[PDB]
A paper describes a structure:
In this step, 2OA is converted to D-2-hydroxyglutarate (2HG) in a reaction catalyzed by the Fe(II)-dependent DUF1338 family enzyme hydroxyglutarate synthase (HglS). Homologs of this enzyme are broadly distributed across multiple domains of life, including nearly every sequenced plant genome. Conversion of 2OA directly to D-2HG requires two discrete chemical steps, a decarboxylation and hydroxylation, making the chemical mechanism of the enzyme puzzling. We further show that despite very low sequence identity, plant homologs also catalyze the conversion of 2OA to 2HG and adopt the same structural fold as the bacterial enzyme, suggesting that DUF1338 family proteins catalyze the last unknown step of plant lysine catabolism.
To better understand the unusual HglS reaction, we obtained crystal structures of the enzyme both with and without a bound substrate. HglS and HMS structure comparison revealed the two enzymes share a similar central β-sheet fold common to the DUF1338 structures. We detected a photon emission near 7475 eV, the K-alpha emission of nickel. We therefore assigned the co-crystallized metal as Ni(II) with a small percent Fe(II) occupancy. While the metal cofactors present in the HMS and HglS structures differ, we previously determined that HglS utilizes Fe(II), not Ni(II), for catalysis. The nickel bound to HglS is likely derived from the nickel affinity chromatography protein purification.
Numbering used by the authors: 3 to 278, 287 to 404, 422 to 461
Amino acid sequence: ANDFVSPDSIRAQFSAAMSLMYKQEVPLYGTLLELVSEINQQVMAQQPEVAEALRWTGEIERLDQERHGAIRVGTAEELATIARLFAVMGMQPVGYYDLSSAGVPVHSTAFRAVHEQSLHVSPFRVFTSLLRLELIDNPQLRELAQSILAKRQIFTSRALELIAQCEREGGLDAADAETFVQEALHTFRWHQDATVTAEQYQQLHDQHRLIADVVAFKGPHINHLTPRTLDIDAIQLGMPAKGIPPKAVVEGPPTRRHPILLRQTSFKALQETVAFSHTARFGEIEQRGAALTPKGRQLYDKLLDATRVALGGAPAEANAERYMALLQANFAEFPDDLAQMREQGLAYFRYFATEKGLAARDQEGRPTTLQGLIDAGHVHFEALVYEDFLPVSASNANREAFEAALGLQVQDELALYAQSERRSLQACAQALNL
Ligand code: NI
């Protein structure tokens, strides 16, 4: 057909280049990566069921490089153009996260690949927030922010050319893809020289730290780059030793044998200077578990809400031991047995033909049902890994405004997970001659 490289390959290259750039900017991220590699190796050696799970699903091959980035943009035009940038790399907008409820003036989506085979090549995602200026109730401050943002140009001209070329021609060859990665990366580099005076920076920063982080800098620098660990409890035990003491409160469900959604915590990664005069860069670590169905999401939200009620306040470091204890107690009601998670329809799964099943594929007399094939060892299942982010604690005007700015509708992650599960069952049926 042509000599264009796969968008998935460009995404893997971009993720790797972002990681190297960020490590140069933020040395403690490199320290974290060394700790993640050690923890993940220990889990695989000590927990054969985890090793097997990751082999069945192919995640063992993607795990070591698996990351997400987080960025913030300031204008609708920036969001729409960044969607085009990410589309070069096979990344589509999935989900919608509105923090206007929680008092933070942003709403967001995550750009990611959508199909398990693409995700296998690279599961890189970029959580992308758009600052909302209407929620600023000091008119002169809103005007200042709008004027500063209006005239900045966060994309290099060469990046924009290669985005347009990709769209018109249907892809990029290896040399143009390499140029694209380098040009795109410039958008996300740290720049110490602010675009505002110290006075302006002060007024923006007291309105909300996030407003200054967006408006005062030349572009959308990396807010964090998060590697994936197989055991966030283990990494937390190793992180004080390395000078990145994390928040004791871990976001997400408590420890489980069969994790759900994700768990995450944060740490201070670097004190930076801003020139017109200091600002912190924070890091993050995450552990990714099973994607939940609508039913599972409803149960999750209910138990998390009950934990917060029992806490009597806001989860903070001062109450961390008590919070974590209440979280475990309340989440006892979420089944922690994979068979029940499947039978009760709480999580999405992938199904695989086993060696035993394949060897029996020409037999009559085999079990006539999916459960019967599982029971006889012909089909094996594992949870489908969650690719998205924790929901905002909980009509459509905000999502509609976001989608108008984005230039398309966000994809429904639950529909995408259902499709992954279905494709696995179809592939298993073909492999087993059913
Ligand atoms: Ni994050």
